[PDB]
Amino acid sequence: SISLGLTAASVAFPPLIIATGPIAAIGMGASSIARNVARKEERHTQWLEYKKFLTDGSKHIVVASPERGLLDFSGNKVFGKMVLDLRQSPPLLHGESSFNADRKIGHRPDLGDWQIREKVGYANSISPYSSLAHGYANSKWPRTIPKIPSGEYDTIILGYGHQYQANTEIEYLSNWIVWREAVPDSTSRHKRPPLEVLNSQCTVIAGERKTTVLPLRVLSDLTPECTEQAISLKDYKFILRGGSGGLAVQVGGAGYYDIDANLVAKENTLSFRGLPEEFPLTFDLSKQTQSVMLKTPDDEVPVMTITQKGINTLVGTAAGKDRLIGNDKDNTFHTSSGGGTVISGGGNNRYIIPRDLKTPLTLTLSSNSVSHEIFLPETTLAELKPVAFELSLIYWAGNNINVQPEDEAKLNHFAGNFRVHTRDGMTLEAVSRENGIQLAISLCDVQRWQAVYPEENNRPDAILDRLHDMGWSLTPEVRFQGGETQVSYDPLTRQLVYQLQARYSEFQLAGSRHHTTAVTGTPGSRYIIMKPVTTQILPTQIILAGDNDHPETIDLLEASPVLVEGKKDKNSVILTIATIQYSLQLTISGIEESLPETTRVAIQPQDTRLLGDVLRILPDNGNWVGIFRSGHTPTVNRLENLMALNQVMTFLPRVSGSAEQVLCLENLGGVRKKVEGELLSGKLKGAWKAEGEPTVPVNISDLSIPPYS
Amino acid sequence: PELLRHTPGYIRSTVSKWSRGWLKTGTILQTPEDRNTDVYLTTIQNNVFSRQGGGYQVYYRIDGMAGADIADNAPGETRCTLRPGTCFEVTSVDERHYEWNIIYVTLKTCGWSRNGQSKTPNGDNLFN
């Protein structure tokens, strides 16, 4: 139950990169224990305080979690010159332990207590073992180098561990008649420091996989305590060597870093998210040696000195003004939310910029670069104002990115080399117009757009309509990404092509007055063309592919047609459909340059007519003859033949839309049929006799049918 | 109550991708936590056994129909509601009609097995 309070729920798809390294406490070094010792007390009590500091500094040199693949060397305070080798299956840990010191014999770990006692000669050989200073001049508080369990490790937390020499003396306790290890008496001449520091270094050599190095964060805000702690540790030497998997360094906040990233690795991060959120950062990837200045009152202190090689994924601070300069190679810049400047050198450069920028961010485009992709993980397209003849990302509300080139004379360059992604997935592209360059849409991922705007209807026609609503210039060919089908549109010819390569795909099409609709059919594909909602709709074109094995089926039941007329020409049948008030027209074509003679169109549930049957009856000349006419009779809704005899238990399902069922009893025999019907559930209105005459009532007990009618 | 045993039940579902012969006899299947599984006792004219939707059409014939209560329906249609938490035993699946994307499955009564993942390897759940 106590542990439950330290757990955190997972965050799904973080739109930006955050800091995940531990933050150092205040007073981690030997200054605090020095002040605790500064009070005038017994010497052996002072030494006991120092020894307790060493015991805690060595108690937790490493916490290993191979299940999650994490190693924590933040509790390392006394193990200096640490070297970690992740190349071996059990990682190799080497280093230097802190050790005691005698004014004359030095440190001698190989001896027992009696041997050192004889060497210095402070007690008699008859004195008990309890009278001697246990561990004098022969101890190492790390004791044995800890053994890391074999496992697969990808995150390494690095502490700031120094190796210490504990200069100690021998104190006589006459009243306790014992001999003890004590701190040297500084009043006696000038005695050696009670704790002297020797090494201020660390080293990690990464294996073959991707490794994340998170040094302890010491400059995590601008408070005087954190600032002074970081200024103390400003010369700590970090030596990082990455593998071919990739090395991601998240700098703690202070020290000397020497990063040697593998050039083969695809992505070598250098993240500064650990610094204070509002930190003025000025970094350059074309400089090997760089110092990260910190402005203290009246002075500058190089709180960092980074020497880097093989880095291509600079990550700026959280919300500070960052001046990032890139490299002549490919780069990826995770900018901060405080604005700044992101000069990007040659090669291919990608940029990830957040929303709500506290200051306009300026993107300078180098003349040597080739392509620039801008990702907006938190910005939707509706927040950008479509400015013509300008590539700058001008926001409707908020500070706007100011994309500029290095040279305006070659401003014409970069056309079609500037893709601005968006949280909804829609991708702008810098296409050169006749008298300038513009941002126009070419790619549009329907899945992410549906995710961000779920409530509104998601149909490609509605999508395009909405883009035309906002007044966004569009590319000569625009493609829709995702969905069961592929959609393309050409504004230059203003034509919509939709390909339903999915087999037996149930598809719904509504025409619009703003585009011509093109459909590519597949075997088994069914098009559910509903009642039109607008008039003056541009012509429709559907192409089938008949394989003579599994015929396509076309259903127009819910279209609610009134009059459908046909014509044929040039291996293509042009149909027109007139509803009660709307109208539409379509052309059926084929891929094999021949209209399939097996494809069936289901005009009514029991009226499925083969394309061949209509195909013969329609003349080769360009003349229209009706093929479906409601003006002959109401839309028959059921066609029951009379070969079935006796009890046949006819069930006719209810229907929400029509609210009127028409059952056609058809006789194929030459004998006048006389059926003794019976209503058990439902009501009848009578039998049709004429097209414009109301339903003639007739008794359901007697149903006489003429032959061949 | 009688026809709850003599009359077998029928179900139709759609699956995006089907693996040839991956189903074996004796496999345990389980319905998701739906309110009531709406099933149709007749498919000859109800138009549920007919091909509809994209992909493979998979058909179930429940020999054990008992345990389903009918709902408020217009007199003339047979529709029943099945309570979730039911064991299902898939048997007799053949793909001689592989190009027509038709799967035939035989079912019978089952007990309280409490196991059986219904999501196909491609991720499509059955009994929908």
Where does residue A343 rank: exposed (0-12), middle (13-18), buried (19+ CB within 10 A)?
buried
**Region for residue A57 given its phi and psi (left: phi exceeds 0; alpha: psi -120 to 50; beta: otherwise):** alpha
How many Cβ atoms sit within 10 Å of the Cβ of residue A6? 6
Backbone angles phi, psi at A190, to 5 degrees: -130, 95
Please tell me what resolution, in angstroms, this structure has.
Answer: 3.1
CB contact under 8 A, B100 and A550: yes
Residue in A closest to B99 by C-alpha: A550
Residue of A289, A517, A525, A368 lying closest to B52 (CA atoms): A525
CB contact under 8 A, A505 and B46: no
Q: Where are the beta strands (DSSP E) in A287-399?
A: 289-296, 299-307, 313-315, 322-325, 331-334, 340-341, 347-352, 361-365, 369-375
Strand order in the sheet with A163-167: A99-101, A163-167, A196-199
Which chain A residues are Cβ-neighbours of B76 within 8 angstroms?
651-654, 681-682
Residue in the structure block whose two tokens are 């008298």: A435
Rounded Cα distance, A228 and A301, in Å: 11
Breaks following residues of chain B (C-to-N distance > 2.5 Å): none
CB contact under 8 A, A504 and B101: yes
Rounded Cα distance, A560 and A577, in Å: 10
Question: Residue A55: which residues within 8 A CB-CB, separation 6 or more?
Answer: A141
Rounded Cα distance, A411 and A414, in Å: 7
Q: What angle do CA A200, A204, A209 make, to 5 degrees?
A: 165
Tell me the shortest Cα–Cα distance from A278 to chain B, in angstroms: 46
**Region for residue A418 given its phi and psi (left: phi exceeds 0; alpha: psi -120 to 50; beta: otherwise):** beta
Tell me the shortest Cα–Cα distance from B35 to chain A, in angstroms: 24
Rounded Cα distance, B86 and B84, in Å: 6
Q: What is the DSSP letter of A472?
A: -
Answer whether B76's CB lies under 8 Å from B45's CB: no
Q: Which two tokens stand for residue A676?
A: 């003794």
Rounded Cα distance, A112 and B29, in Å: 72
CB contact under 8 A, B76 and A652: yes
CB contact under 8 A, B99 and A654: no
Answer whether A237's CB lies under 8 Å from A259's CB: no
Give the torsion through C-alpha atoms of A458, A464, A467, A468, to 10 deg: -140
Q: What angle do CA A659, A663, A667 make, to 5 degrees?
A: 170
B6 to A352, B38, B83, B109, B122: CA distances (angstroms): 66, 19, 19, 12, 35
Strand partners, A296: A299
Residue of A230, A215, A64 lying closest to A153 (CA atoms): A64
Tell me the shortest Cα–Cα distance from B112 to chain A, in angstroms: 35
CB proximity under 8 Å: A 587-646 to B: 605
How many Cβ atoms sit within 10 Å of the Cβ of residue A707? 12
Which chain B residues are Cβ-neighbours of A652 within 8 angstroms?
76
Q: What is the DSSP letter of A6?
A: G
Answer whether A444's CB lies under 8 Å from A421's CB: no
State how beta strands A369-375 and A418-420 pair: parallel
Residue of A673, A674, A678 lying closest to A647 (CA atoms): A678
Tell me the shortest Cα–Cα distance from A414 to chain B, in angstroms: 43
CB contact under 8 A, A506 and B53: yes
Method in brief: cryo-EM
Of A504, A549, A653, the CB nearest to B55: A504
Of B45, B54, B101, the CB nearest to A651: B45
Residue of A135, A120, A130, A129 lying closest to A54 (CA atoms): A135
Answer whether A61's CB lies under 8 Å from A143's CB: no
Which chain A residues are Cβ-neighbours of B45 within 8 angstroms?
651, 653
Which chain A residues are Cβ-neighbours of B55 within 8 angstroms?
503-504
Of B42, B53, B77, the CB nearest to A504: B53
Answer whether A50's CB lies under 8 Å from A37's CB: yes
Rounded Cα distance, A203 and A92, in Å: 11
Q: What is the DSSP letter of A38?
A: H
Rounded Cα distance, A596 and B22, in Å: 36
CB pairs under 8 A between A and B: 36
Interface test with B, best of A651, A661, A684 (most B CBs within 10 A): A651
CB contact under 8 A, A502 and B54: yes
Q: Where are the beta strands (DSSP E) in A308-454?
A: 313-315, 322-325, 331-334, 340-341, 347-352, 361-365, 369-375, 402-405, 418-420, 427-433, 436-445
Tell me the shortest Cα–Cα distance from A679 to chain B, in angstroms: 12
Give the torsion through C-alpha atoms of A124, A128, A130, A136, to 10 deg: 40
Rounded Cα distance, A428 and A470, in Å: 14
- Tell me whether A228 touches chain B (CB under 8 Å): no
CB contact under 8 A, A654 and B74: yes
Backbone angles phi, psi at A148, to 5 degrees: -80, 130
Residue of B87, B72, B82 lying closest to B34 (CA atoms): B82
- For residue A226, give the H/E element and its range: helix A224-232
Residue in A closest to B76 by C-alpha: A651
Rounded Cα distance, A436 and A442, in Å: 18
Which chain A residues are Cβ-neighbours of B51 within 8 angstroms?
504, 524
Rounded to 10°, the helix A43-59/A31-38 angle is: 160
Breaks following residues of chain A (C-to-N distance > 2.5 Å): none
CB contact under 8 A, B76 and A484: no
Q: Which two tokens stand for residue A105?
A: 């014999």
Contacts by A679-685, CB closer than 8 A, 24 or more apart:
A681/B74, A681/B75, A681/B76, A682/A652, A682/B76
Which chain A residues are Cβ-neighbours of B46 within 8 angstroms?
653
Strand partners, A293: A302
Residue in the structure block whose two tokens are 């709500």: A356
CB contact under 8 A, A682 and B52: no
Interface test with A, best of B42, B46, B51, B78 (most A CBs within 10 A): B51
